[PDB]
Structure formats: C-alpha cells, structure tokens
Amino acid sequence: DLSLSDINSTVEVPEGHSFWKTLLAYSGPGALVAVGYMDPGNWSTSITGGQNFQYLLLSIIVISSLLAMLLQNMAAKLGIVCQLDLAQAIRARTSRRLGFIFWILTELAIMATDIAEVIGAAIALYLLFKIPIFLAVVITVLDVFLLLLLNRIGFRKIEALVVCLIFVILFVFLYQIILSQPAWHQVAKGLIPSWASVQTSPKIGGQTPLSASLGIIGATIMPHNLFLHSAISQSRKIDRTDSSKVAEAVRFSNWDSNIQLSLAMVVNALLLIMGVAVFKSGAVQDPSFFGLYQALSNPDMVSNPVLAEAARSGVLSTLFAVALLASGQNSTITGTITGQVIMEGFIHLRLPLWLRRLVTRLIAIIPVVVCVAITSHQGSLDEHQALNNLMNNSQVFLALALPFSIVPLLMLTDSAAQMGNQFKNTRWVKVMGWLTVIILTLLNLISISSQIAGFFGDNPSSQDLLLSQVISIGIILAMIGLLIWTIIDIRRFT
Ligand SMILES: N=C(N)SCc1cc(Br)cc(CSC(=N)N)c1
C-alpha cells in the first residue's frame, strides 16, 4: 500500500555530523532523475541553438536548470515528508476518473520519452555496429532481459550505474570540447542572463532568440521525472518524528538532486558549445542523429585542424553514437520505475517489471517500425529525418501531461493539509513556484497548437490547417477544464 514497496526506506545511514559520508549513501535518487534530462530528445535543439546564437542561449539553459531543480526538489520533499509519491497524493485527493486520466497521460509521456530513447539507441546501433535500421529496433526491444539483469543488482549499484552512464555521455562531449579549445571568455559572457536572448531581432535559421529561449524554458521539466523523484526520495528510511532529521533529509535530497541536475545542465551547455565551437557556422543541416554523425565524421565541418584529423580518423562520430547508447539505456530503468509508480498509485494496478517494459517498449516501437517501413518503402530516403520528425512529434504528450503534474505538486506541497505548518513551502518558493508553473503551463498550451500543426508536416494543406486549429483549440480547452477541475478538488482538500 506504499510507493515502491520493494526498495522503500531501504538504507538510512545518517551518522552524527558526518554529512558528506552520509551524502555518499543516498546520492542515487538524484542521478536517476538527472540522467532523464540528458536524453537525445533535445540534443539537436541545443546544437541548433548554438549554431544560430553562438554561446547566447547558455543563460537560458541555466535558468531552465534552476526551475527544474526547484520543481524536482518540491517533488522530493513531498516524497520525503508524506512518505508517499505524487501519484498517490493526487489519487487520494481526487477521484478514480481523474486518477485514470492522469495515468494515461503520464503513460503517454513516458512512452514519448521511450520512443525518443529507442530511436536514438537503434540509430546508435546502426552507426556503431552498422546494424540494419530495422534490426536495430528489434534489438533495442530486447532490453527486457537487460532489465531482468538490472533487477538483481540493487540501488547502491544501479544508481551508481546511472552515474556511470551520466559521466559517460558527459565525458564523451567534454572530450570533443577539450579538443575544440573554445573561447571560454565568450562562454562566460553567454552564461550571463542578458536581454539579447529574449529579443526577436535576429532571425537565424527561422529561429529567433525569444523563440529558442521560450522553447528551452517550456522544455524545463519532465512530468514523469517528478513522480520518479517523489518515489525514489522515499528509498531512504526516515523516522518522520524528529524535525531535525527530516529537515536534514530535505537538505540531503536537495544537495543530491542539485549536484546531479547540475551535471545535466553542464551536459546541455556542452551540447550548445558543441554546436558553436566544434561545428562550423551552419554546418549542421540535418538535425538527425545520422546528420550529426556524418557532420562529426566530415573534416570540413569542424573548425580546427585537430578536429579535422580526428573526424577523418572517425572518432568524434563513434563517441557520439556511444553517448546515444548511454542515453537510450535510461528509459529501461527510469521509465519502468516511474511507470510502476504511476500505475500502483493512480489505478492501483500491481504489475511486474517483466510485462511493464514489454508493453511499453512494444507501444513505443510500433510507431518507430511503421515509420521505418514507410521510409524504406520510399527507399530509406529521408528515413533518419522521418525518425527525427517522429521523435519530435512524440514530445506533444509531455506538454499534455505537464500541468497535471506540476500544478498538483505545487498545490499539495504548499498546503499545510499535506506538509504541515512546519515543512510547507516558504513564501519565497511560493512565488517562484507559482510563477514557473504559470509560465510553463502557458508555454505548453501555446506549443500544443504548434505541435498539432506540425503533425501534418511542413506541407501546409489549407483544409487541414483549419482542422488543426479546431483540434488544438479543443485540446487546450479540454486541458483547461481538467486543470480547473483538479484545482477545485485540491483546494477543496485544502
Ligand atoms: N528533453 C526532452 N525529453 S523534452 C523537452 C521538452 C519538454 C516538454 Br514538458 C515539452 C517539450 C516540447 S516544447 C515545444 N512544443 N516546442 C519539450
């Protein structure tokens, strides 16, 4: 009847005032969430923003990282304090019908992340092992056995394995930046929160600063990682009777998550400065993973003689495919964990890790294999671009499910009926939290129509444009209705 009954309150080792050694024990939950923020679903958008506004959007990365840290800290606090995950809190403060709606929505969000992971991983297979595109997908489907072997390891090592993957994809891109020898003075200048980023004056590659900046901002949090954090934060036993120990545990999880998400922000910055320093101005014409592979494998695309020699030696691209693999391994873990969390919390369905990963991977690869079928039937022509378009269209479910995950979390963490007058949110975070929640919900409701219209490709059918407008208005109004319903229920609780 409690979240993650298998590893809930497993190891609690806070000894005296030796926080650091204690810090070393529970450092796992942060990495599991951070690694999700390093998925290839936005690798191109970082390199693209870099080429279009070199070292300019680096401050937006920092701000988005700060906001994600804020919301993930709120989720970890809810988990730590109430000894229950966000799904459970929401399902208990709301009817089964809304619980089921949220369940399906977050299933679709984790499935979109899984589609991105499978596409990136199958393409990484294609590139590294030259496995046929269609076989790389059916090979990635074999991650259920990797999950079986992963089940017997334990979180002291599983979370360390996630840290291993994190540093893998981090050093892969830091090595190529070390060889680039970029102008770190312009990097520090970009990291400042300048107003050039919010302006609309430059229009490089049909992308203005305000557009790329707002996209980074709206793309701040991942709804499934909220639930993941509120569930994994309970893996450390807490007495829930000593305010000093619970406030200490809050500091623990905060420092952990902030380290890990800082690692993630550093990875995003590395992607941006990768697009700026490594690649030549506008060299990247194909955002696809294959596009970036050949661009890193073509010496005329780099901006340094050393990088030219290395790219001709065919290393930069291989390290990129490796990072693709390291990033696609994330879903197998976190998607399963978070999906189990959301099932067992929203619909009270106890399923094993066997049939979970199976159904998720199948539903994810269905569209992938359909896309591959259609493109290879047109002759593997634009097959990688079509895969990237699928990857990017999948990301609409995240916009669909984000409010129904952030508004409830903020409400339940601010209410004393859930946290008490001692551990509720400060007046400081009350303002920042609500501001960020409003901003993101607005941006995502906006992006709903953009994505729905992008479903019809870059060919604007006049009759299909009005249909897209109708569908988008309907979806945004339905989300508005669901949001006000959830607000009413939660405020009735509080
Ligand atoms: N890195 C990832 N796996 S998701 C980044 C992200 C998160 C949300 Br939430 C919404 C969007 C789409 S924002 C748009 N419609 N332009 C993107």
Residue numbers in the entry: 13 to 506
Task: Quote the authors verbatim.
DMT1 is a member of the conserved SLC11/NRAMP family, which is expressed in all kingdoms of life and which constitutes transporters for transition metals such as Fe2+ and Mn2+. SLC11 transporters are monomers and their fold resembles the general organization of a branch of the APC (amino acid-polyamine-cation) superfamily containing transporters for amino acids and glucose.
For that purpose, we have soaked crystals of EcoDMT with Br-BIT and oBr-BIT and collected multiple datasets at a wavelength corresponding to the anomalous absorption edge of bromine. In this structure, EcoDMT adopts the same substrate-free outward-facing conformation that has previously been observed in datasets of the protein in absence of the inhibitor. In this conformation, a funnel-shaped aqueous pocket of the protein leads from the extracellular solution to the substrate binding site. The omit map of the EcoDMT Br-BIT complex displays density for the aromatic ring and for the isothiourea group located close to the metal ion binding site (termed proximal isothiourea group), whereas the other group (the distal isothiourea group) is not defined in the electron density reflecting its increased conformational flexibility. The proximal isothiourea group is located in a narrow pocket in interaction distance to the conserved Asp 51 and Asn 54 in the unwound part of α−1 and to Gln 407 on α−10, which were shown to contribute to the coordination of transported metal ions. The distal isothiourea group is located in the wider entrance of the cavity and might thus adopt different conformations, which is consistent with its undefined position in the electron density.
